[PDB]
Symmetry: D2
Subunit: 97 residues, 4 copies
């Protein structure tokens, strides 16, 4: 859906996919982290399940379990460098720090 | 998403697609009908737009504009024969007659 | 939710509520119209059910069954005069004519 | 919406509200925890904002910012005792450990 990727995230994903030499694209998932928390998940996809929803931003195929689409919509996946750390960052306008 | 197709609807769509000789699959859309009304729309898709979400039920590729996904989720597309009329019927558990 | 009312719709509802002499506010609902269609519904509410969601725009209490919230979100209820007809009009940005 | 409370959570919330001696009810909120994470938030509400959605389970008024409703729907708020720890636990069927 209105899940998007920044230029740097799409480059990064496409880099992983090119070095891997295969793959359909990118899974965005969600999981519990504790009793009052959620963790975002990134995985490679080779084959979408019949439960998956598939879309496109910046020529990247993003795959999301249909059930997880509620928690993920509005997400911008970015890829940022902060100090010694470099990595993906999920943003959502309608969520605060 | 948890949009599904009955056996008869999937047969029917697959029949249209086979006779057409080409096509990716099925677009579900939505449009206004009047001042307090909505009409469901069926179309063939050849190429999904970057705004589209794509999923699968019964080997049929269903394509929905990401913005329309709110109004369509939970829909069962059926294909029924009633009297002299034969045609698609959209059902949703959470909607009444 | 991000269901809103124009000034004219809120005036109109508030007029009905004042003339009625009682009532909590406004129910927005949804129902089938045919085999591929939906009809928007307006009703007065006196008591929200435990299944209802309640919100506020322009000092009007709007009540929506929680299950119907998917089809109604993003709606602007307006109240318009066109020719000899005067009445409520449901709009949604993400829906076309 | 189809946000619910277990018996123990509703008792616990009602206990806090009775000891506080005032208050409308319970705010469920959401916030970032890191770069790929979310944290659930519980607060007392005295006055719902015009941006809030309000509902009811077990005689508890639950208030949610309309924008946060996407991430929170399907949540069961429970209140559990595990070892030395006792506290609220958010569950969602469509989310895994
Ligand atoms: Hg816990
Ligand atoms: Hg009208
Ligand atoms: Hg029909
Ligand atoms: Hg980071």
């Amino acid at each position: 859906m209105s899940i998007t990727l920044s230029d740097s995230a799409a480059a990064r994903v496409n880099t992983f996919l090119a070095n891997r030499g295969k793959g359909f694209g990118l899974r965005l998932g969600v999981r519990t982290s504790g009793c009052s928390g959620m963790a975002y998940v990134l995985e490679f996809v080779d084959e979408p399940t019949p439960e998956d929803i598939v879309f496109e931003d910046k020529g990247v195929k993003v795959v999301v379990d249909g059930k997880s689409l509620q928690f993920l919509d509005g997400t911008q996946l970015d890829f940022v460098k902060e100090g010694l750390n470099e990595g993906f960052k999920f943003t959502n306008p309608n969520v605060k720090d």
